[PDB]
Design a protein around this ligand. Structure first.
Ligand code: G3K
Ligand code: MN
Ligand code: MN
Length: 183
């Protein structure tokens, strides 16, 4: 699994994921499912910004959380957008709204419901992707054009298939449920 992560992911995404887990006291060599899940979520955030113009998105995910709040503050002060209660993943400069990106191995609408209750902000856009080519966005507003989201779904389906060929998928899918159960 650790071998798969460094094989399928850009080494900068890998280092970002390693840097993130170390700052939270987690070993990437042990919590291998979370390692792959952080890499996958980070890649989707990068592929999401590619779907718009070079003026379109500000990527908040993958940066130092303390510094990421200063940019959130600068955006809210400049644009007048209400400040979110949790750090989002992107800011949309065109629609002038923050975006939460979800990547789940569970069902998309159940995952949306959990994010919507936890975010509990309104005006923070939610877009969920699954490894089964499904997606769900707030009020059916998918933000990106069809070709941009197709690239994301295909990439996630690709990751699933190659995990499935290494017998790693079923452990990856069950880990999110295990993380959800412990409460
Ligand atoms: C998506 C991911 C990696 O799933 C897993 C999967 C398996 C395991 Cl063992 C642990 C987590 C996660 O880290 N999750 C699941 C929901 C909570 C958290 C999350 N955090 C942020 C953030 O910004 O901190 C997000 O932006 C966000 O989309 N998800
Ligand atoms: Mn995030
Ligand atoms: Mn997210």
């Amino acid at each position: 699994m650790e071998d798969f992560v460094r094989q399928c992911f850009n080494p900068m995404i890998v280092e970002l994921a390693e840097k993130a887990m170390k700052e939270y006291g987690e070993d990437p060599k042990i919590e291998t499912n979370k390692f792959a899940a952080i890499c996958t979520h980070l890649e989707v955030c990068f592929m999401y910004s590619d779907g718009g113009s070079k003026h379109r998105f500000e990527i908040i995910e993958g940066r130092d959380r303390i510094m990421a709040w200063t940019v959130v503050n600068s955006i809210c002060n400049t644009t007048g957008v209400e400040k979110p209660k949790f750090l989002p993943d992107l800011y949309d400069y065109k629609e002038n709204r923050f975006i939460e990106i979800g990547v789940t191995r569970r069902e998309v609408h159940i995952y949306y419901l959990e994010k919507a209750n936890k975010i509990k902000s309104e005006k923070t856009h939610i877009h969920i992707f699954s490894f089964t080519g499904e997606e769900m966005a707030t009020k059916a507003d998918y933000t990106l054009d069809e070709e941009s989201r197709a690239r994301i779904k295909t990439r996630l389906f690709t990751i699933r298939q190659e995990m499935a060929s290494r017998s790693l998928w079923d452990s990856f899918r069950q880990s999110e449920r295990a993380a959800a159960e412990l409460a």
